[PDB]
Amino acid sequence: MEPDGTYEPGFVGIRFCQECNNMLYPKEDKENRILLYACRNCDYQQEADNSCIYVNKITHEVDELTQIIADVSQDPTLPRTEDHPCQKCGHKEAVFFQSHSARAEDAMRLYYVCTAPHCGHRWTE
Amino acid sequence: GPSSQNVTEYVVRVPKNTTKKYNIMAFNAADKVNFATWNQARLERDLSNKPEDQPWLLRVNGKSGRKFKGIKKGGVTENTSYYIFTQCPDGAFEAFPVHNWYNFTPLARHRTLTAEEAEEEWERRNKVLNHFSIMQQR
Amino acid sequence: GAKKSAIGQRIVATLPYIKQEVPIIIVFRALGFVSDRDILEHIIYDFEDPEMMEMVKPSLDEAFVIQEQNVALNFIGSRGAKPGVTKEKRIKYAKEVLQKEMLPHVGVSDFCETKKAYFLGYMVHRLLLAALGRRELDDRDHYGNKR
Amino acid sequence: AKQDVIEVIEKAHNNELEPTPGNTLRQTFENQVNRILNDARDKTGSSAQKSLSEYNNFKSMVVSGAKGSKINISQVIAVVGQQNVEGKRIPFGFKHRTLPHFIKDDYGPESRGFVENSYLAGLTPTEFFFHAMGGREGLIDTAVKTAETGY
Amino acid sequence: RKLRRQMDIIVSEVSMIRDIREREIRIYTDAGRICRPLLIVEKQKLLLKKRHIDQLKEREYNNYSWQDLVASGVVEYIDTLEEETVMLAMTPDDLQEKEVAYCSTYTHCEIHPSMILGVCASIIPFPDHNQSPRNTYQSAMGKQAMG
Amino acid sequence: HTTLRKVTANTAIYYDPNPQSTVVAEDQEWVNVYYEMPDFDVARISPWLLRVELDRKHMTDRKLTMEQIAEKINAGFGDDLNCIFNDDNAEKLVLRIRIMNSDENKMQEEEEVVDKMDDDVFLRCIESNMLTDMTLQGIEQISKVYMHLPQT
Ligand SMILES: [Zn+2]
Ligand SMILES: [Zn+2]
């Protein structure tokens, strides 16, 4: 129970209706005081899994963890840096680039993708 | 055994002319269809609302059973062919031509919201203000 | 009003010879893919990201008034053509428009009606990417985009 | 000046840099590199002004106040200086680049605008083209401004 | 690409581009795209060798031609969309000296940099020692002269 | 013009109808902090829970207090918006919001003229209004810039 830490509960949209294959919405059981998920277009109902139904913003999932596929390492127009050691593989020749995209996180922070095998590992400095 | 080392070799036959047309019936894996739980099925061309071009209607078991829609693929192949390789009691392989490729997809046993009434009108009024009750008034 | 606080995701579609804007979801209904999971599969083949799933959701919410291909066709017919209480012809004419007029480069017949569904869906995907902003906004005058 | 820019890029990539108040990090980075390349330009121009002999015909036209200015002498003798469109440095018209000749993400002064050479030494091919972008702004503005003031 | 160098698909025609960060492959064969010839470089060095030059000198009495040169696959045609994704050396000199000078990933090289000029701009000698709009007035006036 | 939207790191909506056994066991002592807060009509207030997280850095610049924000929102919306807040003794700052109803009249007479949209869905409209319209120290409409200058 501390100010410091993190919170990534893994949001959930789909677990769509199994009976007609359509989207599920939260709904109340006032008798059991429990969340349920129902398809709007049929009588099908099923109990929930988590008390969370919706979240908004995150002040920074910086989201460096994904999107950037390892294959980006092949692009000839991207710079090869002699800065060494893929923290994982015992090999230098990292490919790097800044940020990209438009929310580009005003950050200028380099993102590094090793190009050697024995990893395919992504990291920032 | 096959888990260690094995070799098999079977002749492949093609009959000059099949006694029947061979077709493909494809389902979405997401529908997780199990024929183990099918006991009866009917399969007929939907045709009344207007034959060999017309879509398929798949009706499983009784009237209360699941109904599916079968849609014809434009052509079996555009520059190749698809063939079925089958095991025969002699121990050979037998190969059969594909005549058609059909896509089969699920339909609801009873849903039907219908827009013919004034749902379109309700949309004019739609301020996301209701959802359950309209489904009840039906 | 108190609709859901932020209409900034209500994705509509213009179509050729249509007098009125329609939401993209109707067109998918008109292609026959009633299954919301299937439309979601055409729109974004990576349902693993919660943020994309939330971005489409109010557009799904709009879809409820129409829930079958024929009526959806009757919607596009009446929203697009001159008035005609014939209903069924409005559906057939609109059926032929979707067949002939929309994305004609992807095809001109029934036998390639599925192929059009992915491509229309790809545009919504191509659009959602920009709307997340992880995708650059495309220049007006890049020469690669000239003929 | 060029080595000092690389120092500012390294400070930015290291994320050691912090924004100036009232602005974003890119704007600060851009404000800082622009301050360096202009200051470089003016220091070197002032050097060129200092070296002119008194017999020189070129110095006599500017000093009399017949035609052209001190800045023209700078460009002819020392360095053409920064190129720019709509105020800012040459935009990444390609994917994160200015010309295919450069590597992606090269804010260094040459790949993005600034020409080292003087009109006497000649402009390198890239330097040449970026200069034409800066010259076009001047041609277009003449035509557009002419119509609007007229009205 | 190997097929293109070998001409199983038409050089001047097919443009072929990969957008790695998006996992797309676009290929273009429609009319109307602007493209230019470039030298191929390979393994950090030029693929064209002086022996091809000796055949070009030989053309004064032989059937060898620019088309043969394209058939060696030592030059390629690049449209503006594809030109975005290449790493392009300015001149053989620079591609040679390189060690840790800049990069070593080049894929094309310029057959001569002064080729960026159009027809009238080429009459004007030392165009790079001139102020840029000065060159534009000459391109109009040169076209204006008589003779 | 600072809107709550500028200050906010994130928002979340939970179904937590039992504060005494809240969906975030770590949040549980703050519920212990609030039981004297209208304990009679906790059977009457709604079971939907709104939870907000705030940026410490925005909160420092605007030099605000959590009680200033809580008093701002309660004052802005009205008595319906039942607010409680986390302890100041943390680097993080979070605010927990429930909605109170009209109590006595909700006995389902004719059909309860609301057309029975879910209360959560009403909560998202609350959060929408809450982000965009709330103007803590945002005394006007001057977009959101303000640049201070020293002149010599
Ligand atoms: Zn359902
Ligand atoms: Zn590595």
Side-chain angles (χ1 to χ4, degrees):
Chain A
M1 293 180 173
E2 293 87 2
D4 179 79
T6 188
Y7 180 73
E8 45 187 349
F11 186 77
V12 166
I14 215 211
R15 64 128 27 63
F16 289 167
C17 182
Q18 75 177 350
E19 176 274 349
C20 58
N21 213 31
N22 306 130
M23 194 160 61
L24 300 181
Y25 296 133
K27 79 163 187 78
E28 169 92 23
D29 186 353
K30 277 175 188 185
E31 188 276 328
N32 295 281
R33 198 61 62 81
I34 61 176
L35 183 59
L36 302 175
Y37 275 149
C39 180
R40 280 186 184 167
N41 63 43
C42 62
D43 56 13
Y44 180 70
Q45 62 171 24
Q46 57 159 84
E47 71 211 91
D49 57 341
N50 201 332
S51 301
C52 178
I53 68 164
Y54 168 77
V55 295
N56 199 340
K57 297 292 186 176
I58 312 258
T59 82
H60 279 354
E61 57 253 31
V62 285
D63 198 15
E64 53 172 359
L65 302 177
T66 48
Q67 287 88 8
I68 182 62
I69 65 166
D71 212 75
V72 77
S73 61
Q74 301 291 320
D75 182 20
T77 53
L78 287 173
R80 313 300 195 278
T81 174
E82 70 286 352
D83 182 74
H84 29 106
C86 159
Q87 69 179 40
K88 185 184 299 180
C89 83
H91 191 276
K92 54 167 183 69
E93 309 296 327
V95 144
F96 68 88
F97 37 76
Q98 88 181 20
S99 84
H100 301 269
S101 62
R103 226 196 77 238
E105 249 6 277
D106 194 24
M108 203 74 71
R109 183 181 56 181
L110 295 184
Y111 282 29
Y112 285 142
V113 184
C114 186
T115 185
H118 187 209
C119 64
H121 177 71
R122 171 195 84 71
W123 73 103
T124 185
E125 285 198 342
Chain B
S3 52
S4 62
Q5 194 181 348
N6 185 351
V7 169
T8 54
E9 187 170 3
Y10 298 148
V11 73
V12 175
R13 299 191 295 258
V14 168
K16 187 190 293 175
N17 186 37
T18 58
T19 59
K20 62 189 67 186
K21 292 171 182 165
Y22 296 124
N23 302 313
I24 283 286
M25 166 183 289
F27 301 139
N28 191 331
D31 189 26
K32 303 180 175 279
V33 182
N34 192 354
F35 307 143
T37 54
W38 290 0
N39 178 51
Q40 295 184 338
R42 296 183 68 93
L43 183 71
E44 294 162 357
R45 296 293 183 137
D46 185 21
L47 183 60
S48 302
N49 53 71
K50 304 182 179 63
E52 189 177 302
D53 184 83
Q54 299 299 323
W56 287 112
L57 168 58
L58 176 52
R59 303 188 282 178
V60 176
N61 294 333
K63 291 300 180 76
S64 57
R66 295 184 71 201
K67 299 198 181 58
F68 313 135
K69 169 157 53 92
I71 303 302
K72 176 162 167 167
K73 182 187 181 311
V76 176
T77 44
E78 290 179 355
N79 190 43
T80 59
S81 46
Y82 290 148
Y83 280 147
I84 304 306
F85 275 66
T86 74
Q87 294 169 341
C88 289
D90 50 15
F93 267 160
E94 204 154 318
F96 305 145
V98 178
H99 200 256
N100 303 116
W101 186 296
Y102 280 115
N103 184 17
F104 282 78
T105 58
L107 304 178
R109 298 183 190 192
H110 182 69
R111 191 174 71 88
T112 299
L113 191 33
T114 300
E116 180 175 1
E117 186 264 338
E119 277 80 25
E120 215 184 273
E121 196 286 318
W122 171 94
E123 189 279 332
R124 230 174 174 36
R125 297 187 288 102
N126 179 40
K127 201 179 57 84
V128 185
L129 185 44
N130 200 329
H131 65 275
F132 203 75
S133 308
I134 202 67
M135 298 263 353
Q136 304 313 126
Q137 285 163 350
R138 185 48 180 105
Chain C
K3 184 179 187 198
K4 181 219 184 264
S5 234
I7 201 170
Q9 69 281 350
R10 193 178 168 266
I11 164 180
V12 297
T14 313
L15 286 176
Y17 299 130
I18 305 305
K19 304 178 182 299
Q20 184 53 266
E21 307 304 328
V22 297
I24 198 65
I25 211 69
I26 315 197
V27 194
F28 279 105
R29 295 304 187 221
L31 287 169
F33 299 152
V34 297
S35 169
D36 306 345
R37 185 174 186 149
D38 297 354
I39 287 182
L40 190 68
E41 281 172 12
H42 290 311
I43 286 171
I44 172 51
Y45 53 88
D46 189 35
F47 63 91
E48 297 188 345
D49 180 65
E51 183 190 18
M52 192 69 66
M53 192 160 287
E54 185 64 29
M55 196 70 171
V56 296
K57 188 163 48 52
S59 309
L60 297 176
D61 219 7
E62 194 169 347
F64 279 159
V65 167
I66 44 183
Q67 294 289 304
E68 203 177 352
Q69 186 166 17
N70 61 286
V71 294
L73 279 166
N74 198 52
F75 193 82
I76 302 186
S78 62
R79 276 313 173 281
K82 297 170 305 197
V85 302
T86 168
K87 193 170 183 175
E88 186 176 5
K89 295 313 170 67
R90 286 179 173 198
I91 288 167
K92 292 170 187 171
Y93 154 47
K95 178 172 178 173
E96 287 288 34
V97 171
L98 298 186
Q99 183 144 352
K100 299 164 142 83
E101 290 313 294
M102 177 185 64
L103 305 161
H105 84 281
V106 186
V108 292
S109 284
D110 169 36
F111 323 140
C112 67
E113 190 178 326
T114 316
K115 282 166 169 146
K116 286 184 180 193
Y118 280 112
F119 199 63
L120 191 71
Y122 175 80
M123 294 176 61
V124 185
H125 190 235
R126 179 48 164 259
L127 189 67
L128 285 166
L129 276 168
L132 292 177
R134 61 170 87 169
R135 184 69 181 72
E136 63 188 1
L137 191 50
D138 289 337
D139 189 287
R140 323 279 197 260
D141 208 353
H142 186 303
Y143 243 47
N145 201 62
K146 289 289 179 94
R147 297 295 183 269
Chain D
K2 290 173 71 179
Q3 287 183 301
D4 250 78
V5 176
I6 314 311
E7 187 161 10
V8 164
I9 286 169
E10 184 165 300
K11 283 178 164 186
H13 285 158
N14 200 352
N15 199 16
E16 173 202 10
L17 190 70
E18 73 285 354
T20 48
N23 291 311
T24 70
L25 202 55
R26 262 190 300 264
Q27 288 173 350
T28 306
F29 167 85
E30 205 75 15
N31 183 307
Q32 183 70 270
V33 302
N34 180 88
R35 188 195 63 78
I36 293 163
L37 268 46
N38 175 62
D39 196 20
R41 189 191 67 174
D42 197 83
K43 181 179 182 178
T44 310
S46 299
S47 274
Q49 190 37 308
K50 197 174 190 176
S51 295
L52 285 188
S53 82
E54 192 51 34
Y55 291 115
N56 194 340
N57 298 273
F58 210 112
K59 193 185 193 181
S60 201
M61 281 182 277
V62 168
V63 92
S64 75
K67 272 292 271 177
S69 77
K70 191 177 72 163
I71 217 73
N72 299 80
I73 295 173
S74 307
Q75 293 181 47
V76 179
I77 302 298
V79 50
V80 172
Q82 181 60 65
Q83 304 284 355
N84 54 336
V85 302
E86 303 171 344
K88 317 301 304 173
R89 291 157 77 201
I90 307 306
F92 292 113
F94 288 127
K95 280 183 179 106
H96 290 261
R97 291 198 286 179
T98 46
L99 285 176
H101 302 273
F102 299 123
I103 215 64
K104 281 182 177 169
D105 180 15
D106 193 324
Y107 288 87
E110 300 66 19
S111 310
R112 190 164 165 77
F114 185 81
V115 178
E116 280 186 35
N117 292 272
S118 60
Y119 279 149
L120 197 60
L123 281 52
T124 75
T126 53
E127 288 177 343
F128 176 76
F129 188 96
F130 295 151
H131 195 10
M133 301 180 84
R136 274 274 267 283
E137 183 183 66
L139 291 176
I140 296 162
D141 141 288
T142 307
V144 166
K145 179 165 58 182
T146 294
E148 184 74 79
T149 58
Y151 184 40
Chain E
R1 191 158 238 114
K2 180 180 181 175
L3 296 191
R4 195 210 221 155
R5 303 294 174 79
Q6 288 173 349
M7 293 183 306
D8 291 335
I9 55 178
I10 312 167
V11 183
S12 319
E13 285 292 334
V14 183
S15 293
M16 49 168 293
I17 312 91
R18 181 182 181 212
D19 232 295
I20 306 181
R21 74 189 171 144
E22 303 197 18
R23 284 174 286 166
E24 299 198 341
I25 289 165
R26 296 178 178 222
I27 302 181
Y28 282 103
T29 184
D30 53 333
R33 295 172 290 104
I34 311 84
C35 67
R36 68 195 193 104
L38 293 176
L39 306 178
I40 297 313
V41 299
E42 181 63 26
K43 300 191 291 184
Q44 308 178 331
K45 62 189 179 187
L46 187 67
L47 191 65
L48 179 78
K49 295 180 288 175
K50 76 172 189 59
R51 288 171 171 182
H52 296 116
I53 308 301
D54 222 49
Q55 292 174 282
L56 294 163
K57 175 56 171 172
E58 217 187 44
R59 92 186 185 285
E60 294 181 3
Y61 55 95
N62 201 331
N63 205 20
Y64 195 85
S65 70
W66 167 264
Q67 306 289 102
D68 286 340
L69 192 69
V70 173
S72 305
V74 301
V75 298
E76 185 167 336
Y77 277 129
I78 297 296
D79 97 311
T80 330
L81 190 68
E82 192 171 354
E83 193 160 25
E84 184 162 77
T85 63
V86 314
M87 180 61 203
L88 204 136
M90 174 62 70
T91 183
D93 197 14
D94 173 81
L95 187 132
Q96 199 77 267
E97 178 64 55
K98 70 179 186 61
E99 185 186 355
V100 296
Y102 192 77
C103 74
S104 289
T105 44
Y106 303 99
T107 57
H108 292 86
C109 186
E110 293 286 5
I111 47 188
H112 195 289
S114 65
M115 296 292 103
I116 73 182
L117 290 181
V119 168
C120 287
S122 295
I123 291 173
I124 149 164
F126 311 122
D128 65 295
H129 290 353
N130 289 281
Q131 183 206 35
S132 54
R134 196 52 48 197
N135 295 289
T136 304
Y137 294 105
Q138 168 56 28
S139 295
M141 291 178 231
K143 183 169 48 63
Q144 257 281 329
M146 64 185 64
Chain F
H1 189 195
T2 311
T3 56
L4 187 49
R5 217 270 179 144
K6 307 303 288 182
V7 197
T8 292
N10 64 71
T11 57
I13 297 174
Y14 296 138
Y15 188 86
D16 183 37
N18 190 348
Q20 296 78 33
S21 300
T22 172
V23 308
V24 186
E26 182 170 4
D27 296 338
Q28 187 66 88
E29 314 300 322
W30 310 255
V31 178
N32 187 358
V33 174
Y34 297 89
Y35 64 94
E36 67 289 347
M37 184 66 185
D39 56 341
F40 184 88
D41 49 30
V42 296
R44 182 66 59 178
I45 66 181
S46 300
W48 307 102
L49 168 81
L50 167 59
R51 200 186 79 155
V52 190
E53 182 176 358
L54 298 187
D55 178 27
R56 181 64 190 185
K57 295 197 169 78
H58 282 308
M59 190 81 171
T60 304
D61 178 56
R62 308 299 191 273
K63 57 177 293 180
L64 299 173
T65 77
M66 296 292 282
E67 188 183 284
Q68 201 170 10
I69 297 180
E71 287 187 354
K72 171 61 179 181
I73 55 173
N74 175 10
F77 198 75
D79 205 5
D80 293 342
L81 195 74
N82 183 344
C83 296
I84 62 180
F85 51 85
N86 76 321
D87 186 17
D88 188 82
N89 197 15
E91 63 185 349
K92 66 178 179 66
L93 291 160
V94 299
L95 178 68
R96 158 184 319 246
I97 308 171
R98 296 186 187 278
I99 185 67
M100 190 166 302
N101 56 26
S102 181
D103 302 339
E104 192 263 318
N105 50 40
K106 300 202 154 60
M107 61 179 77
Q108 190 184 351
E109 184 74 14
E110 307 289 314
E111 61 185 350
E112 185 67 20
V113 186
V114 175
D115 294 336
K116 287 169 171 181
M117 250 312 173
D118 282 340
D119 203 14
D120 101 286
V121 179
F122 181 33
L123 193 60
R124 295 172 198 255
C125 297
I126 286 163
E127 185 249 7
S128 190
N129 170 262
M130 176 199 74
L131 291 181
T132 315
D133 194 31
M134 291 298 107
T135 60
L136 34 85
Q137 82 262 5
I139 59 96
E140 60 193 351
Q141 72 188 359
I142 52 167
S143 79
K144 28 68 69 204
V145 45
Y146 113 71
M147 48 198 135
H148 194 68
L149 319 70
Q151 303 291 276
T152 298

